[model samples]
Target: LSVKVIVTDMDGTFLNDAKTYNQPRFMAQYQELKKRGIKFVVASNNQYYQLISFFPELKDEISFVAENGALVYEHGKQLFHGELTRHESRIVIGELLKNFVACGLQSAYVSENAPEAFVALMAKHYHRLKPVKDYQEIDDVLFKFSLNLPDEQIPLVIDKLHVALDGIMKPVTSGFGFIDLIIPGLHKANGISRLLKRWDLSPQNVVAIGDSGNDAEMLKMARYSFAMGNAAENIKQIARYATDDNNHEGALNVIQAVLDNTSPFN
Candidate 1:
């Protein structure tokens, strides 16, 4: 009955299809959570800068686990940031992903020769983006490399990536037709696990929700985990509970339940 933390994904879980959330409702709930000393965190595969920009007023008030667990922050202060070594990054760039970008600590670097449409879309999500002549020439602590391929080619690519990047980097998808190669044995659950350790909280004290594959691990980690009404079948299967559609503010109901110290599920 005592929930100490709530962490949720951004795109298809917290935010609606339009990329907007119920701000006033969330702000009110946020104040109540703060009064009770319960932590509210937003965990996403999105960039840290982009996530913070979405919540201008509550940016510093809440926590973030960005870059698919590569970067963890507690109230605007960094707790952890996973960086790939130059050699590790260099080896990864030679793969078949012609449209991929090098994700760094400060900015996302993409080849200037990449399609204009791809760069245009990347600009919307990554706040700080840099166009480089070559990724190997850029001196930065890289985190992961992201790829956006055709939707139908997802499964084939995933299988190929697993075989190709087996021990070096693990591939995970957060986009419709995208894949991200990050550190092996890392995911959003690991980030939530780090927060649980930092706060000394148990899994039962947390309520997490999401709609995609990247969010599966965290949903599995929380006892009160949830899947959006429109969540993928695997996600809907992973969580113990379910919320309304993202467009209908299903998560707010879940938050209200937590705030009320009540459980709709045993």
Candidate 2:
């Protein structure tokens, strides 16, 4: 295989602060890639619904790995993947809710049906500078929980939470100070590998581009991995190439170069 697939992370790597696709050139590039039969996988730790929001054309143009690797979608159809059973999910939710209440951390649980299925203002630091206008007040628990931890203590808070919720929760940090917990074993790397197998491709044909710790495993699994210039130093160390920063259209620039001499389709 000659690297016919490209998988990209969304938050810090693709979207801007407002979760907007700031790259105007993406559509043209995306269409070109599609035409060349180069499959694009939107691999993220986002929930299925959250992932769908970033790419409205996901049903047609992209495959998805939502809630880390707990879910997979291709051609608008669900494939074999992982998700906590209803009982397991309920137990996890119970524990998380208890801890959130005890720690006084601001949190919300998001679901496929609504953006704010469960919002809790446990702390004042959770205030958003530019809050989404259409968000709602959630009355019930959600399928995915999003926590807004203090920026200064993000790593410490995450480590503590991970320890407190060990074996029950899987944590993933977004570009913002958001910490998310999903079912275990559903990492982006596993998700990408699952999709590759489904498409009859192999890891050798994939290129992963990302910029954070959450992206580490997926990048490691990719034969051709490009870490953004703005990525953490450790991440850059492991990448085969350190491309330009996202502000400089790093992904677009790097993938174009990779596909230039390579076949888009096997």
Candidate 3:
């Protein structure tokens, strides 16, 4: 198949556990993709501001499906932005707070596009966080509301929060101890679908790679999907191929396979 685009999740798929990748090797693969006129889209649960900062050199060379598909940004312009209204925002936050207290979770963070003192405190752990005074005071747009907890508390908190928020917010398990709340019907696949339409491309012409629950939707949407070897068992089941773990340059390996027309599946 002729690959027109490659959409991939960031953490645990592209970047290693240490939050970095082989820059030189990646640049070489990126140049080859560019030579073939293929687009590379970073579809992550992360914020656009942080993603862009990571690859400032390729800011214009690629695009982003950010905030778990709440928005898509390209070349310093927003192609799509999905947000919850103030009323919905309040209800979501209220429920989260209630559930957090009920679950006996100590701290939870709300991510927005605004800057606040909390951002500095959370920065040590989460680089993509945008803290605000009050979540309800966020008048711009609400993409993701993320919180962290002890690893053992993930299931309990998620279960309780799922019941509390119900149909209002979608809870995505971003990582080991991280849970991100996004608006219903908004995810990586939805954002990529929009981008596909805008680019006049089809799912058959694309390949996607991911390693977590948040990546399931986009993986399902692509004709060729690869789950990193380090991915959870459930995530691996959703992918058509299994590549090396992220720490070993898993995404780059898949890219080479695609370029060579070699099946990474077997």
What are the RMSD figures for all models against the true structure?
Answer: 3.3, 7.4, 5.9
For residues 170-258, write the lDDT of model 3, one tens digit per residue.
Answer: 77677767787767787788888888998999999989999998788888888888999999999999988889999899999998887
lDDT of 1: 0.84
User: What TM-score, over all chains together, does every model reach?
Assistant: 0.82, 0.69, 0.74
Q: Which stretches of candidate 3 lie over 4 Å from their true place?
A: 90-120, 123-139, 146-167, 170-180, 263-266
Worst 10 residues of 1 by lDDT: 257-266
For candidate 2, give the lDDT of residue 29.
Answer: 78
Per-residue lDDT tens digits for candidate 2, residues 149-243, read 55676787678768776776666675566776665666788878888987899878888999988899988888888898789999998887777
CA lDDT, every prediction?
A: 0.84, 0.66, 0.76
Supply candidate 2's per-residue lDDT for 265.
30
Clashing pairs for model 2 are 69-186
Give me candidate 1's TM-score against the actual structure: 0.82
Error of 1 at 147 (Å): 3.9
lDDT of candidate 1 over 114-171, digit per residue (tens): 8999999988777778999977788788878888888898888888888877788888
